[PDB]
Amino acid sequence: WTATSGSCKGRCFELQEVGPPDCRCDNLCKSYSSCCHDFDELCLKTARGWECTKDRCGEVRNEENACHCSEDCLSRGDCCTNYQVVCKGESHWVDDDCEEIKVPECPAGFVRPPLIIFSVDGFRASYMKKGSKVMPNIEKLRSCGTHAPYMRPVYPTKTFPNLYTLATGLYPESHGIVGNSMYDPVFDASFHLRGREKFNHRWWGGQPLWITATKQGVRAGTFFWSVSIPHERRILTILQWLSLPDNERPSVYAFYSEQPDFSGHKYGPFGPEMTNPLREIDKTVGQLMDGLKQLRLHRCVNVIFVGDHGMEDVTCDRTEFLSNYLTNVDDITLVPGTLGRIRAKSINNSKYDPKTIIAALTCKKPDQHFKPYMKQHLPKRLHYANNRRIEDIHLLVDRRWHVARKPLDVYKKCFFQGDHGFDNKVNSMQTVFVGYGPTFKYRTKVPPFENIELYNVMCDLLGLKPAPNNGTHGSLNHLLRTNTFRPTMPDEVSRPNYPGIMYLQSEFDLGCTCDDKVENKLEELNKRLHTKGSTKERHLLYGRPAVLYRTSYDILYHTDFESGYSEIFLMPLWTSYTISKQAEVSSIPEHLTNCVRPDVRVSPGFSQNCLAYKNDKQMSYGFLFPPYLSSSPEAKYDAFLVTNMVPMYPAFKRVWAYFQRVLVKKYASERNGVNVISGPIFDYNYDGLRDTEDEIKQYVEGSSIPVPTHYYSIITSCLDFTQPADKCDGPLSVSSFILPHRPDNDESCNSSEDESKWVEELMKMHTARVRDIEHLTGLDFYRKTSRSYSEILTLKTYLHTYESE
Ligand SMILES: *[C@@H]1O[C@H](CO)[C@@H](O[C@@H]2O[C@H](CO)[C@@H](O[C@@H]3O[C@H](CO[C@H]4O[C@H](CO)[C@@H](O)[C@H](O[C@H]5O[C@H](CO)[C@@H](O)[C@H](O)[C@@H]5O[C@H]5O[C@H](CO)[C@@H](O)[C@H](O)[C@@H]5O)[C@@H]4O)[C@@H](O)[C@H](O[C@H]4O[C@H](CO)[C@@H](O)[C@H](O)[C@@H]4O[C@H]4O[C@H](CO)[C@@H](O)[C@H](O)[C@@H]4O)[C@@H]3O)[C@H](O)[C@H]2NC(C)=O)[C@H](O)[C@H]1NC(C)=O
Ligand SMILES: COc1ccccc1C1CCN(C(=O)c2cn(CC(=O)N(C)C)c3cc(Cl)c(C)cc23)CC1
Ligand SMILES: [Ca+2]
Ligand SMILES: [Cl-]
Ligand code: NA
Ligand code: NA
Ligand SMILES: [Zn+2]
Numbered sequence: 001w002t003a004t005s006g007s008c009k010g011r012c013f014e015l016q017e018v019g020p021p022d023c024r025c026d027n028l029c030k031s032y033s034s035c036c037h038d039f040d041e042l043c044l045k046t047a048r049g050w051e052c053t054k055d056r057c058g059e060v061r062n063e064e065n066a067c068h069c070s071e072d073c074l075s076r077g078d079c080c081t082n083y084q085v086v087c088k089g090e091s092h093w094v095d096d097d098c099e100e101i102k103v104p105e106c107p108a109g110f111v112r113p114p115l116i117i118f119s120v121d122g123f124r125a126s127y128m129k130k131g132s133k134v135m136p137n138i139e140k141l142r143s144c145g146t147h148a149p150y151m152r153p154v155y156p157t158k159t160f161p162n163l164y165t166l167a168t169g170l171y172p173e174s175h176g177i178v179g180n181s182m183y184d185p186v187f188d189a190s191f192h193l194r195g196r197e198k199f200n201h202r203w204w205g206g207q208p209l210w211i212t213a214t215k216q217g218v219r220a221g222t223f224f225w226s227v228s229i230p231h232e233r234r235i236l237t238i239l240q241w242l243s244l245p246d247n248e249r250p251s252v253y254a255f256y257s258e259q260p261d262f263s264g265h266k267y268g269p270f271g272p273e274m275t276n277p278l279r280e281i282d283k284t285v286g287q288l289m290d291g292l293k294q295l296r297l298h299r300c301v302n303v304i305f306v307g308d309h310g311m312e313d314v315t316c317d318r319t320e321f322l323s324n325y326l327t328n329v330d331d332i333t334l335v336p337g338t339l340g341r342i343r344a345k346s347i348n349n350s351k352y353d354p355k356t357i358i359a360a361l362t363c364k365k366p367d368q369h370f371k372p373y374m375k376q377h378l379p380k381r382l383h384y385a386n387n388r389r390i391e392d393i394h395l396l397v398d399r400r401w402h403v404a405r406k407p408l409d410v411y412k413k414c415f416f417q418g419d420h421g422f423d424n425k426v427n428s429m430q431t432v433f434v435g436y437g438p439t440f441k442y443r444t445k446v447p448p449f450e451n452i453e454l455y456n457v458m459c460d461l462l463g464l465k466p467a468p469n470n471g472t473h474g475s476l477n478h479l480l481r482t483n484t485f486r487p488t489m490p491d492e493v494s495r496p497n498y499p500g501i502m503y504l505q506s507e508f509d510l511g512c513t514c515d516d517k518v519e520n521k522l523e524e525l526n527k528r529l530h531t532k533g534s535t536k537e538r539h540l541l542y543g544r545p546a547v548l549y550r551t552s553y554d555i556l557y558h559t560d561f562e563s564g565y566s567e568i569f570l571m572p573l574w575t576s577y578t579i580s581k582q583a584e585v586s587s588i589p590e591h592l593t594n595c596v597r598p599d600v601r602v603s604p605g606f607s608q609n610c611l612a613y614k615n616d617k618q619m620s621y622g623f624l625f626p627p628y629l630s631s632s633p634e635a636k637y638d639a640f641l642v643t644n645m646v647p648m649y650p651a652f653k654r655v656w657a658y659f660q661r662v663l664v665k666k667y668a669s670e671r672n673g674v675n676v677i678s679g680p681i682f683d684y685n686y687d688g689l690r691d692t693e694d695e696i697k698q699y700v701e702g703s704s705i706p707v708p709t710h711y712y713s714i715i716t717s718c719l720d721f722t723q724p725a726d727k728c729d730g731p732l733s734v735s736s737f738i739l740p741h742r743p744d745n746d747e748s749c750n751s752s753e754d755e756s757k758w759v760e761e762l763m764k765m766h767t768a769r770v771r772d773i774e775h776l777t778g779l780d781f782y783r784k785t786s787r788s789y790s791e792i793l794t795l796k797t798y799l800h801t802y803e804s805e
Contacts, residue, residue: 002034002077005320012043013237015221015250015278027237032199050232050287051734052080057087066609067236074294077243080416081291082431093289093298094137098144102481103439109246113438115461116303117223117254117303118288119166120281121159122261124269124310125150125430134275135282137289138434141305144443145436146479152450152799153309155382156339157353157429159261160193162308162451168206169469171383171688173390176205181335182389183401207467209458213252218466221250225514226498231257231284239291252462255288257281261420268417269428302437302461306454309420312399312428314338316414319402320369326360329405338394338421340370340403354393361395363749369401376686377747379766380776381799382424383470385686399426425767425801429632449797460485472771475793487789490780492546496555496564499601501531508604511611514595516637527634531601533557538726540576541675542716543784547573549690556601559637561625568693570705571646574679574779575624579668585661588627592640593665596621599643607642608705616701616708618743622648624678626660634673646680647700647707649743651747655762656711656739657753663763664715671717671733673725678709681738681776690778712773714781731787735800738768740775782799 001021008025017026023036025043047064048056056069066080069087073079084090104113128147131137154165154172158180161172172178182191184203191198213220221241225234238253260277267273285305292298322340323329331352335341344352355375361372373394375385384390399405399422404410422429430448456473459466466473474487510550533555540562547553552567561577565741596610613621623644630636638644648656667674682691684698698707714736718728739762745751750758770781774796782792 004035004037006036008036008039008042012039013222013240015219015224015241015248019126019797027222027225027229028680030228044229044233046061050080050236052083052086056087058647066232077240077295078236079294081287081294083237084294085290090293092286093293094140094286098140100442101299101438101583104300105296107296110300111246112251112463113461114242114250114297115252115458116288116301116457117252118257118285118303118305119163119254119588120257120260120305120307120432122259122264122309122311122418123281123307124260124264124428125307125432125434126427127260130270131278134279137282137285138305140536141285141303141434141436145303145434146440146442146444147435147448148433148446148448150430150448151306151433151454152430152448153424154451155384155424157309157424157426158338158421160198164204164208166306166308166451166454167208167210169452169466169471171452171470173383173385173387174206174470176203176389178384178385178387178389179335179339179341180413184334184389186388201621206469209252209455209464210610212464212467213457213462217449218252218462218464219248219250220252223254225256227258231255231280232287233468235284235287235291238288239295242292242297242707246437252458255284257284261308261311264418265416266418268313269311271417272326277394280607298439299438302435302439304454304458305434305436306451307431307433310427310429310431310683311418311420312338312422312426313417314400314402314419315417316402316410316469318369318395318400319404319407319410321404321407322361324365326357332357332405334403334405335391336404336409337402338397338419340393340397341391342393342395343391353424356415357393362746368398368749370395371747373747376709377740377742379768380683380688380740380772381766381768383688383772384686396423397421399423399428419741425799425803427803435479441479441481442782444479445606446476447794447798449476450799456485470799472793474790475797477790478794484790487793489789490546490548492780493549494547494551494553496544496547496553499556501600503598503603505598505600508598508607509583509615510596510598510604510607510609510642512596512598512609512642514597514637514640515591516595516597516640523634524637527559530559531557533562535559539578539675541578541726542782544576545574545677545779545781546783547778548780549778554602556599556643558625558641559635560631560638563624563644565602565643567602569680569682570606570608572624572643572679572733573777574677575644576675576677577625577629578673578675579629579664580673580724580726581668583629583631583665583668585628585665586630586633586636589633589636592627592636595640596642596645597637597640599641602643607698608645610642612700612703612705613647618649619647619700619707620653621645622653622656626664629664646711647705649741651744652711652739652741654745654751654755655759658759659713659763662756663760667715668725671715671725672721672723673717675725676713677781678713678714680741680772681710681778682706682709685707687773688775690776708741710738710741710770710776712736712776714770729786731791732782732785732795734770734795734798736768736770736773737766738772739761739763739766764802767800767802769799 003021004023006023011025024034029035053067061070164177210220263277453471456471477484554565563572563575627639696706717725719731719733748758
């Protein structure tokens with residue numbers, strides 16, 4: 001109930017919201033059907049439109065007008081944004097040369113530069129170049145301030161998940177808004193775009209910027225605008241709030257455009273009808289900037305122009321139908337469109353079976369345009385699993401397609417020509433970022449970055465301490481002139497042991513054998529220096545990774561590689577080795593095919609055994625440093641140490657062998673040497689975080705050898721590839737992956753072919769940030785470089801995407 005009989009006189013766009021059943025005059029009242037009877041009349045004036053004309057100049061203040069051109073308007077804060085241009089001989093903001101803003105130039109009583117967030121739905125990154133002729137205001141912000149060629153959205157590249165990710169620094173799996181439509185089984189309730197349920201606070205996790213601001217005494221006012229309030233009125237209202245007395249005036253503002261997304265759905269991302277919505281958004285930006293110039297705030301305010309996601313070409317005839325794959329298509333509920341999520345239609349159905357559903361959806365048609373996954377098998381870069389609202393069965397849909405349950409769902413619902421929601425690495429889904437103001441850099445281009453990083457920077461810009469989030473604070477310091485946040489490296493928690501030779505061969509009873517019984521003082525002092533770490537500056541280029549949790553581990557040195565060997569998990573946490581461009585691939589000698597050798601630095605009780613692998617009919621083993629890349633036949637023996645062995649499914653050894661035998665050398669040749677760090681990952685509860693031992697769900701049969709859910713590799717070289725990986729003076733270049741450790745290759749439809757036709761495509765799909773690997777392992781990499789820490793934070797957030805330009 002609202003008793004809508006109260007009045008909005010003197011209250012238009014009030015900043016504190018009043019409680020029921022008192023009527024409201026704030027910018028969201030419409031959306032709640034709670035505005036006072038006179039809100040439209042008083043608060044939403046339209047008379048004479050939005051601009052001044054020559055003959056309005058100096059007029060008698062008529063309060064009925066939408067905005068004013070009277071003489072008192074400047075100090076009333078309510079002029080039309082073009083007032084000074086039309087009536088006072090001034091120029092539009094876009095026509096002025098840009099001049100570096102070295103310091104904030106603010107009026108008396110401003111404690112900090114205000115932040116204005118200009119957010120645009122569906123604004124695809126390539127619009128900046130392709131629409132540049134019709135967006136002069138946006139182009140000036142772009143070229144004069146700081147910009148990225150694009151910003152990466154989160155998955156799914158839908159509106160609600162991304163806008164709330166922008167606001168919280170959080171992955172959708174942690175903030176709770178995992179789709180535009182959701183079912184929460186604990187609530188037993190559904191969330192939808194259309195309707196009132198999306199208003200209930202229990203859906204919304206984390207702590208969005210407006211709450212973070214409020215809690216730390218920065219005034220945020222009211223960010224969100226009921227949909228029918230026109231853009232011009234939003235802009236005028238922001239400008240009016242900026243004229244409030246210091247004690248009442250917010251420090252952060254937001255504007256939101258439903259465009260160009262609204263038109264992009266209808267006409268496609270590059271339909272000829274798209275030029276007009278771009279012009280219109282530019283005009284709105286021009287109004288804001290002219291309005292700021294009027295208030296003398298145009299060299300005071302920090303403006304962020306930012307999008308939620310792009311837009312792809314998608315038509316109804318590119319729809320895959322699940323009825324063409326499943327017989328039982330009525331026992332399922334599908335969330336459909338540019339992603340798919342499947343659950344059982346009825347909880348009382350124990351005839352429902354996820355395994356049979358996945359299998360029926362797996363490589364069934366030759367050009368199939370979606371791929372089923374159990375959510376825990378999705379690429380780890382998507383961070384899309386650890387939420388009860390994310391259904392177990394997920395369909396990653398190819399760009400340009402839709403998935404639907406039955407054809408009737410599409411025509412009892414071609415209308416649309418655009419859509420979004422696809423994998424967040426897809427070019428058409430990329431979006432924009434521009435920062436302009438005293439705190440941003442002048443005329444600076446920065447590399448693409450993920451939208452999860454922005455919350456920390458918005459906090460920096462406002463002097464706030466960010467709530468805990470998924471950004472890496474400091475990774476975007478290079479966008480800023482000042483207010484940088486100066487992070488320190490985490491402290492190492494566990495120190496390694498450096499074991500020497502402590503055990504005799506006969507003390508091991510591992511069931512392992514090796515044909516290695518063949519016999520010189522020159523080369524004997526050699527192998528001693530090698531086991532003491534004499535080649536370690538070769539193979540460990542950036543210092544050893546720090547272990548950030550409590551555990552017991554040994555550093556092991558070898559001619560060709562160095563490892564941090566975990567006495568708890570009985571395998572390395574990490575193995576580090578450098579392959580120069582000149583290096584040669586040899587094969588495994590025949591006599592050494594099943595060779596596994598005891599490591600006399602490591603006790604039997606902290607070693608794996610070969611017997612367990614023999615008994616375990618599903619599981620085989622691999623090595624972290626590959627025998628193929630040994631520097632000499634004698635060094636090869638080291639690669640067969642039981643301390644270099646890790647458990648691997650035979651299906652997975654196909655992937656791993658191809659990567660080690662073929663790809664590592666190829667990367668070394670192309671990148672002028674590479675440093676490699678590889679190791680296992682255990683993430684049985686799919687939370688993106690290292691498992692403790694009591695979380696491991698699977699062991700090599702009859703043993704305490706834990707089975708990794710994934711294997712990672714981090715491959716670093718010199719950004720300037722004229723310098724070899726081991727002698728680099730400047731910035732680094734990285735690519736990484738987190739390969740799922742699976743007992744089959746069902747994920748790759750062409751896996752019955754030669755690895756040269758499918759393995760690399762699998763790896764690219766499972767591309768990762770070093771940061772993702774750090775969360776999954778509790779390790780901290782790049783501890784000792786000559787590079788600044790902020791630059792190294794940027795490198796750890798890099799994702800190599802394998803899209804073209
Ligand atoms: C990305 O960044 C985020 C943010 O930093 C990272 O997420 C954090 O990770 C922490 C570790 O997983 C986690 O810390 C735990 O907090 C527990 C209390 O949680 C509540 O309080 C916070 C603070 O206000 C709040 O944010 C939480 O909100 C969650 O839940 C509500 C709904 O219930 C949602 O609205 C909201 O979106 C959010 O959901 C997400 O998180 C939960 C888990 O918290 C997921 O299940 C959801 O799916 C969703 O993803 C909560 O309201 C606290 O109780 C924990 O303590 C346990 O462990 C410690 C060890 O230190 C130990 O002392 C205790 O034994 C305790 O265990 C007991 O509870 C167990 C569970 O029932 C039980 O099994 C045991 O037997 C014990 O009884 C713990 O400290 C933190 O909550 C989240 N924060 C957020 C916002 O998600 C995320 O990790 C980063 N991601 C990556 C990939 O890096
Ligand atoms: C970059 O933007 C930042 C950054 C930080 C803090 C805040 C912001 C913006 C986000 C967008 N802003 C909005 O007004 C929103 C408009 N919609 C669409 C809508 O309501 N419909 C029915 C289509 C939203 C949806 C969500 Cl889920 C959210 C969380 C916000 C909005 C303004 C504030
Ligand atoms: Ca985990
Ligand atoms: Cl969705
Ligand atoms: Na076996
Ligand atoms: Na296959
Ligand atoms: Zn849309």
